[PDB]
Amino acid sequence: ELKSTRHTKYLCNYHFVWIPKHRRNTLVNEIAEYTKEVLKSIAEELGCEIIALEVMPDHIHLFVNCPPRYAPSYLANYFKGKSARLILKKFPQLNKGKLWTRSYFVATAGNVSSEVIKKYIEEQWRKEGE
Amino acid sequence: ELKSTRHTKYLCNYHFVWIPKHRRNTLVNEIAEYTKEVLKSIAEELGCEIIALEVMPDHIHLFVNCPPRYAPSYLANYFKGKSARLILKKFPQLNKGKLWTRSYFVATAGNVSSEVIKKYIEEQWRKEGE
Numbered sequence: 001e002l003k004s005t006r007h008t009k010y011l012c013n014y015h016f017v018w019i020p021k022h023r024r025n026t027l028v029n030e031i032a033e034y035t036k037e038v039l040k041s042i043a044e045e046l047g048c049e050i051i052a053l054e055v056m057p058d059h060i061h062l063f064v065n066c067p068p069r070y071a072p073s074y075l076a077n078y079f080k081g082k083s084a085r086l087i088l089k090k091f092p093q094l095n096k097g098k099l100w101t102r103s104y105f106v107a108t109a110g111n112v113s114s115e116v117i118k119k120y121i122e123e124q125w126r127k128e129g130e
Numbered sequence: 131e132l133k134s135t136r137h138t139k140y141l142c143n144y145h146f147v148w149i150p151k152h153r154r155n156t157l158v159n160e161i162a163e164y165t166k167e168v169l170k171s172i173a174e175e176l177g178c179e180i181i182a183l184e185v186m187p188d189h190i191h192l193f194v195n196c197p198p199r200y201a202p203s204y205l206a207n208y209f210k211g212k213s214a215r216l217i218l219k220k221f222p223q224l225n226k227g228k229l230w231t232r233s234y235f236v237a238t239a240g241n242v243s244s245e246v247i248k249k250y251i252e253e254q255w256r257k258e259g260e
């Protein structure tokens with residue numbers, strides 16, 4: 001749903017997708033479970049609401065609702081960078097270089113109805129006055 | 131369409147909506163014209179692609195595709211902040227108080243297909259190797 005901040009009404013959903021560096025059977029078993037845990041922890045840290053999270057052997061698909069103060073690149077690098085530090089610190093048998101590649105995919109999601117926009121405009125005028 | 135940078139494939143579309151302060155009949159004629167010109171110049175400046183722009187007497191509805199480096203709040207405040215400065219400069223009669231209110235609405239837009247995501251994943255593994 002639409003959320004509100006100081007002087008803001010927003011709905012910011014993003015699909016973030018990225019892959020583990022070189023092994024296609026990296027994110028499995030306990031490693032996959034810890035990966036989900038840390039990504040959820042980071043989301044909570046940033047005030048983001050995870051809509052869907054998939055940690056598959058060959059990729060991560062994170063669909064999340066975030067505050068408007070964050071740029072998609074800032075978010076991707078925070079999720080990837082912080083999760084990698086934690087995951088590599090936890091499992092020694094990894095720790096051989098980078099966990100992720102330096103690329104990521106991001107796509108905005110949403111279908112704002114004209115009624116929702118019309119209503120926001122009417123509300124601002126009602127609030128501010130003419 | 132999907133776009134790409136150094137190490138990112140992205141689709142970042144946002145709807146920005148905001149209204150002028152108690153003047154519900156000022157964004158007309160020459161002022162409306164200049165406002166549209168200024169918002170288009172700012173978009174070009176930031177590397178954003180305007181999908182649709184509406185400058186109406188009671189509100190601005192900016193639908194734009196932007197680089198992932200920008201936060202929605204930065205964009206909203208830059209578009210509003212810089213246009214206000216330029217507009218008040220060209221039309222001194224608007225120099226009384228703030229041109230815009232401090233509020234704004236922002237909503238992400240998009241319906242990315244699974245095929246696009248699947249292709250991104252396969253392309254990264256093809257480039258990275260396993």
Ligand SMILES: [Mn+2]
Nearest residue numbers: 054061062247
């Ligand atoms: Mn998926």
Ligand SMILES: [Mn+2]
Nearest residue numbers: 114117184191
């Ligand atoms: Mn509109």
